[PDB]
Amino acid sequence: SGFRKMAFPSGKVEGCMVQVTCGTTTLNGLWLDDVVYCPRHVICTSEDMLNPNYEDLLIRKSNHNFLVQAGNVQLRVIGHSMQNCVLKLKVDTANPKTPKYKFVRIQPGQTFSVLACYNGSPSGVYQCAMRPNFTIKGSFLNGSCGSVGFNIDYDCVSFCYMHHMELPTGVHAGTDLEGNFYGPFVDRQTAQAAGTDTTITVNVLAWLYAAVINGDRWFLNRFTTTLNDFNLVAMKYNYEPLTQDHVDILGPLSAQTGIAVLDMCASLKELLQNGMNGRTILGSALLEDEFTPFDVVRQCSG
Amino acid sequence: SGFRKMAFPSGKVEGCMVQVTCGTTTLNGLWLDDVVYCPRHVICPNYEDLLIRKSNHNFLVQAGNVQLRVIGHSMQNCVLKLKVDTANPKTPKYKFVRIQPGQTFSVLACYNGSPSGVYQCAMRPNFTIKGSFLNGSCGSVGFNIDYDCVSFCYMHHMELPTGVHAGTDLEGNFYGPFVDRQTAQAAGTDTTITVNVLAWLYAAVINGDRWFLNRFTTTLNDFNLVAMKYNYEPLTQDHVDILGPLSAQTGIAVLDMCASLKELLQNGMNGRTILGSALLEDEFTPFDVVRQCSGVTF
Numbered sequence: 001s002g003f004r005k006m007a008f009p010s011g012k013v014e015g016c017m018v019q020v021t022c023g024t025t026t027l028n029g030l031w032l033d034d035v036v037y038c039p040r041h042v043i044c045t046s047e048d049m050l051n052p053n054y055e056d057l058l059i060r061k062s063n064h065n066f067l068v069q070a071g072n073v074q075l076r077v078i079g080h081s082m083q084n085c086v087l088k089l090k091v092d093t094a095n096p097k098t099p100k101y102k103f104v105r106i107q108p109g110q111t112f113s114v115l116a117c118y119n120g121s122p123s124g125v126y127q128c129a130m131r132p133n134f135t136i137k138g139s140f141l142n143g144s145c146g147s148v149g150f151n152i153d154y155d156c157v158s159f160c161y162m163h164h165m166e167l168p169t170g171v172h173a174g175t176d177l178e179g180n181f182y183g184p185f186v187d188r189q190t191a192q193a194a195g196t197d198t199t200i201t202v203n204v205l206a207w208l209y210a211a212v213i214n215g216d217r218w219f220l221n222r223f224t225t226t227l228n229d230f231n232l233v234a235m236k237y238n239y240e241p242l243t244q245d246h247v248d249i250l251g252p253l254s255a256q257t258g259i260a261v262l263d264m265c266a267s268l269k270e271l272l273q274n275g276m277n278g279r280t281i282l283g284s285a286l287l288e289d290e291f292t293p294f295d296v297v298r299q300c301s302g
Numbered sequence: 303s304g305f306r307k308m309a310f311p312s313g314k315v316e317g318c319m320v321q322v323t324c325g326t327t328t329l330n331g332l333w334l335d336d337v338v339y340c341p342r343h344v345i346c347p348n349y350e351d352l353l354i355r356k357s358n359h360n361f362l363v364q365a366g367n368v369q370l371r372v373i374g375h376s377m378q379n380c381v382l383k384l385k386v387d388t389a390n391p392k393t394p395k396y397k398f399v400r401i402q403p404g405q406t407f408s409v410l411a412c413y414n415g416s417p418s419g420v421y422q423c424a425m426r427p428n429f430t431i432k433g434s435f436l437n438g439s440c441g442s443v444g445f446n447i448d449y450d451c452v453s454f455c456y457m458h459h460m461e462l463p464t465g466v467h468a469g470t471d472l473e474g475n476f477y478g479p480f481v482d483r484q485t486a487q488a489a490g491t492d493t494t495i496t497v498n499v500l501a502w503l504y505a506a507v508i509n510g511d512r513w514f515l516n517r518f519t520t521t522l523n524d525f526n527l528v529a530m531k532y533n534y535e536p537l538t539q540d541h542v543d544i545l546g547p548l549s550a551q552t553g554i555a556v557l558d559m560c561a562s563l564k565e566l567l568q569n570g571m572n573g574r575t576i577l578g579s580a581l582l583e584d585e586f587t588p589f590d591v592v593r594q595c596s597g598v599t600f
């Protein structure tokens with residue numbers, strides 16, 4: 001019993017965190033085999049950040065300009081290449097602590113763990129979700145660039161995020177490990193704004209099923225809804241449309257609890273209309289949207 | 303910017319998790335040097351009598367895909383200490399510390415000696431933890447990290463009928479009035495950790511959330527009368543002193559933040575949130591707020 005925002009154990013990622021210094025800029029890098037991945041903006045000064053030409057700035061650098069530090073050991077950079085917004089620094093040592101890993105690009109609503117680092121040292125681990133507006137509501141200070149987001153399903157680490165920047169609203173933007181940004185963001189100081197954020201409907205429903213599995217039923221009602229009528233209501237509360245894919249994904253939880261997806265959708269409609277009335281669901285007075293259907297099953301069943 | 307429930311990096315503890323199988327019971331053990339610590343209920347009660355009937359070979363200890371050989375066994379309170387032939391090469395610098403209610407720690411939830419998740423907890427004033435544990439999680443540990451030292455403060459033993467959890471420090475002494483047997487046990491009435499709520503209100507101010515601030519101040523006496531009324535823990539002069547640095551950083555005196563908390567408790571939030579929460583969060587200590595809002599690393 002119990003339901004917590006749970007992160008993956010960070011050990012396999014901690015052994016990969018290194019410090020990357022280039023000129024005055026110091027951020028984090030991800031050391032996997034003989035390559036250190038880091039945000040390409042490490043080659044910039046804050047003076048050439050409005051409109052940086054990364055191809056031009058990179059060509060002017062040599063391997064010895066990049067100082068890579070793994071613990072108290074300096075790694076020697078033997079090559080450098082840029083892949084989208086990520087810099088790949090080839091080093092002369094393969095990381096002995098390199099776990100089994102994949103680079104995966106996630107979709108909005110997907111969750112992952114963040115190992116927040118400063119100066120190549122891990123300071124904390126938290127859980128978060130890729131927002132529908134492609135930002136993440138992280139906890140990052142200056143120096144956290146290059147901190148990574150991951151999932152540790154089975155013995156393989158799936159790297160899905162690398163932190164690049166904080167937007168004016170205090171939210172965060174970054175890329176997958178291939179350097180492709182999530183969202184319409186660019187690694188420039190140009191005026192950029194997070195799009196209007198919306199609630200991840202499928203995740204709220206998954207969390208409502210988690211509450212039912214944990215014995216909480218107060219919010220359930222005798223009603224059902226059509227998928228269209230649910231989306232017409234949900235859209236009015238800035239909730240993401242629920243697709244047939246989401247309904248299909250919620251199938252196992254629907255089978256385990258005996259509550260049809262469209263029946264849980266009617267509970268959600270009611271909750272949106274009424275609020276909680278001083279009650280909580282899994283110790284929360286708000287509808288939680290950072291647990292996917294896969295997170296709920298994993299945490300509640302194994 | 304941002305404020306998240308953040309746990310310590312679990313790596314130093316992951317290298318210590320092993321599986322302990324005794325008869326039909328399989329749970330987790332904490333392998334430090336040549337000793338594996340685990341809940342004594344793995345032998346299940348008259349624990350002295352049950353333990354004397356066991357031999358070293360009855361305890362199957364598994365560290366990854368390697369079986370450790372048990373060369374001795376002793377009991378310290380509600381923890382079983384299985385002496386093994388191999389010292390854990392991954393043993394970090396560690397201490398066993400007993401925490402006080404309100405203090406926070408990270409929990410590395412494990413099943414079959416394998417870490418599945420890490421989450422941040424607080425030792426409730428009623429000595430329970432609101433964890434997330436399934437059958438097989440016994441022996442999962444709670445810890446803090448201080449520089450490069452792991453302070454082990456909790457080992458999970460059981461779940462109470464309300465879904466909350468009970469366990470011991472690493473010396474086998476239970477937190478709370480709980481015993482490790484199948485009997486009627488209930489978590490006492492819980493209260494809110496006042497000093498932690500205030501710390502989280504300072505974190506919200508540091509993050510630009512000021513709507514709840516007011517011009518008023520209060521006395522520690524007047525505030526504690528309100529705290530008693532709303533099932534909030536008394537705020538001591540020690541708590542006020544601990545909140546000193548946050549008070550200095552934000553310019554909001556502790557008793558000035560207390561008057562904000564007093565208005566929040568009598569009037570509510572009114573459809574507003576603080577750090578994306580409609581409830582007053584009490585699982586961030588004043589130290590957690592300072593560590594996160596300043597970026598301390600391990």
Ligand SMILES: O=C1[C@@H](c2cccc(Cl)c2)CCN1c1cncc2ccccc12
Nearest residue numbers: 041140141142164165166187188189303
């Ligand atoms: O936004 C950035 C980075 C940057 C700047 C412009 C463009 C690019 Cl791609 C990258 C520089 C550091 N940084 C931060 C990242 N996360 C948290 C922070 C908190 C407070 C201040 C800064 C923070």
Ligand SMILES: O=C1[C@@H](c2cccc(Cl)c2)CCN1c1cncc2ccccc12
Nearest residue numbers: 001343435436437459460461482483484
């Ligand atoms: O409470 C216990 C343990 C127990 C039983 C009797 C007496 C003692 Cl001292 C301890 C055995 C497993 N267990 C659980 C521990 N945590 C979470 C759980 C969730 C769901 C089911 C069981 C769970």
Ligand SMILES: [Cl-]
Nearest residue numbers: 105106107110
């Ligand atoms: Cl995805």
